Ligand binder design. Structure first.
Ligand SMILES: CC(C)c1cnn2c(NCc3ccccc3)cc(NCCCCCCN)nc12
Lengths: 279, 65, 286
């Protein structure tokens, strides 16, 4: 369960500044390693972030058309693996193209989505030689990915909390007649939340509730009473204030998110390819 | 040296989840899919799914890093 | 590595086990799914009666898991004829098994491999559930499991009839079988096949009827059996007290829903009556 999970203990961070600190330490550490081994070829941390956003999107595209269909839990697990990996690792030491596939591979194993390696790599849009090479690379990086995740493999996603909140709203909050009318829009917000660092900064329950309440606010519905009355937050006003602030912070992260630009991705991909070809 | 039962004490950092056997009486089970006779024969009831979903919705809702 | 081998412990289908410095190391598919299952589940579980995963490491696709080192298991104690299993010892073993199982079930995980050799004892007499290579989370509606789980002697009749979806009843039925083995010092229902396992179940416990298992006939591999009368539980367990017989009956209820859960078992009068469970330090040592 989340409340005693490794995700809460080790992979929920107190601020975006701490995340930037981790990523900057990773970029600087790689620069120092390269300098000791042998300079404009290096990538700046914001460029690493742009590339990680691009390749997280690529991982989503891979999982969406994967056959047999990947359960949403597996996709969320793989994406969380990707984010966690590039918290403490540079894209110029481990190529995100291979790491994202290794994330999907490990996630499928972890979430008991039993698939054989041949069908997994057969989902890749490659030649059979390319697929076999990718399989070789994935098997090479599987233990590395596991080590970098510190052997914390269970990922608590917001989807089941989302379901539980919908059940609770249907049961206990008749002032909202049909909570299912909130699903699709809330679903959208969840996706948009997933692209930020929110999954590293807040609980799955907070993310699910934020998605639902944003869907309600866009619907013209205020469920302030659901928090105050049904959630029984009228006993301790501090808790209600902190939850409201967490939701506001998540909405702020979503509004301040910027997708990678095409030209910037092209330039950074050329730089990344130089980084992995050289040395 | 006599044993006595006490419930497991684990903080959830979220709202109280109703007890499993209460769900049917509280109207929750009207919103989850009913278990098939095969499922019931195996011992799987819709109460399990509903209870798990509520527990996951409430887990750590109030917690801050 | 940071660990040095001390002695060889055992060999399995999935791995080999050796003592190390003191811990126990269990050394195109990639990393083995059973090792990953143990890692992913044990990283999220912390309870005195659940085996502790301390570290994991390896090279390429070969992985090693580090656990607390245990001294014995319940199979060794059961099979040891030089050890008398007093009612207090039996109650203590059942209590630790049920407490670990209550913790595990509360976190929506089934062990699915319960048997005396998967219940390990350390030198302090703390029983821990181990071998989570078959363990799986439960409660999801859209997930399907396999009915081959649990060793056949400890398999629940719902499993033997092909139940894909199940709950804690599989672990509790295995717990009842473990309790019966503790009482009799021999496997309760030593079947040679699935059909023979079901036959022994119904010959000893009576053939279930539609009243005591309302959806019995809806299970995939259900087949009608002879209507055996079964043996009175007090005839099977002649030294069992009434409270212990009540616990056994609750564990061996054919209906998995009616079968007692770990918490309900822990609340039963058997565990609160005299004598209390033996302290772990005084449990028998083979
Ligand atoms: C958690 C796991 C990796 C673990 C921890 N300790 N440990 C030991 N310790 C020694 C021992 C235990 C129990 C009985 C006898 C010796 C042995 C082992 N596998 C060998 C079993 C052979 C004997 C079976 C007879 N039923 N696995 C473990």
């Amino acid at each position: 369960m989340y409340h005693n999970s490794s995700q809460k203990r080790h992979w929920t961070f107190s601020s975006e500044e701490q995340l930037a600190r981790l990523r900057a330490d990773a970029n600087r550490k790689f620069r120092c390693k390269a300098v000791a081994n042998g300079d404009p070829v290096f990538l700046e941390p914001h460029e690493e972030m742009t590339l990680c956003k691009y390749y997280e999107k690529r991982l989503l595209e891979f999982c969406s058309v994967f056959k047999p269909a990947m359960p949403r839990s597996v996709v969320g697990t793989a994406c969380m693996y990707f984010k966690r990996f590039y918290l403490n690792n540079s894209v110029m030491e481990y190529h995100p193209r291979i790491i994202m596939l290794t994330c999907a591979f490990l996630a499928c194993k972890v979430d008991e989505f039993n698939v054989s390696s041949p069908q997994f790599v057969g989902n890749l849009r490659e030649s059979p030689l390319g697929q076999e090479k990718a399989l070789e690379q994935i098997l090479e990086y599987e233990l590395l990915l596991i080590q970098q995740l510190n052997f914390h493999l269970i990922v608590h996603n917001p989807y089941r909390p989302f379901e539980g909140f919908l059940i609770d709203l249907k049961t206990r909050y008749p002032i909202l007649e049909n909570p299912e009318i909130l699903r699709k829009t809330a679903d959208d917000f969840l996706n948009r939340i997933a692209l930020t660092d929110a999954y590293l900064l807040y609980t799955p329950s907070q993310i699910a509730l934020t998605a639902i309440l944003s869907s309600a606010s866009r619907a013209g519905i205020t469920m302030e009473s659901y928090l105050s009355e049904s959630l029984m937050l009228k006993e301790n006003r501090t808790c209600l204030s902190q939850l409201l602030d967490i939701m506001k912070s998540m909405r702020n992260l979503v509004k301040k998110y910027e997708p990678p630009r095409s030209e910037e991705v092209a330039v950074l991909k050329q730089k990344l390819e130089r980084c992995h070809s050289a040395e | 040296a006599l044993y006595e039962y006490q419930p497991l004490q684990i903080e959830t950092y979220g709202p109280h989840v109703p007890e499993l056997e209460m769900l049917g009486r509280l109207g929750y089970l009207n919103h989850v899919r009913a278990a098939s006779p095969q499922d019931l024969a195996g011992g799987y009831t819709s109460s399990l799914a509903c209870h798990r979903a509520l527990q996951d919705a409430f887990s750590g809702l109030f917690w801050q890093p | 590595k940071r660990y040095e081998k001390l002695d060889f412990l055992g060999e399995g289908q999935f791995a080999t086990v050796y003592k190390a410095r003191i811990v126990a190391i269990k050394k195109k598919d990639g990393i083995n799914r059973t090792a990953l299952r143990e890692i992913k589940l044990l990283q999220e579980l912390s309870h005195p009666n659940i085996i502790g995963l301390l570290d994991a490491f390896g090279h390429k696709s070969n992985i090693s898991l580090v656990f607390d080192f245990m001294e014995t298991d319940l199979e060794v104690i059961i099979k040891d004829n030089s050890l008398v299993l007093t009612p207090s010892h039996i109650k203590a073993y059942m209590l630790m098994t049920l407490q670990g199982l209550e913790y595990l079930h509360q976190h929506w995980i089934l062990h699915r491999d319960l048997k005396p050799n998967n219940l390990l004892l350390d030198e302090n007499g703390v029983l821990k559930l181990a071998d989570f290579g078959l363990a799986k989370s439960f409660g999801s509606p859209n997930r399907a499991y396999t009915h081959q789980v649990v060793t056949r002697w400890y398999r629940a009749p719902e499993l033997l009839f092909g139940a894909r979806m199940y709950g804690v009843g599989v672990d509790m039925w295995a717990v009842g079988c473990i309790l019966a083995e503790l009482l009799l010092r021999v496997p309760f229902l030593p079947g040679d096949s699935d059909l023979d396992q079901l036959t022994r179940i119904f010959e000893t416990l009576g053939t279930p009827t539609e009243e005591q298992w309302p959806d019995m006939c809806s299970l995939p591999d259900y087949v009608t059996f002879k209507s055996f009368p079964g043996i009175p539980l007090h005839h099977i367990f002649s030294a069992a007290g009434d409270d212990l017989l009540d616990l056994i009956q609750g564990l061996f209820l054919f209906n998995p829903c009616a079968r007692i859960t770990a918490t309900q078992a822990l609340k039963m009068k058997y565990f609160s009556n005299r004598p209390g469970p033996t302290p772990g330090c005084q449990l028998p040592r083979p």
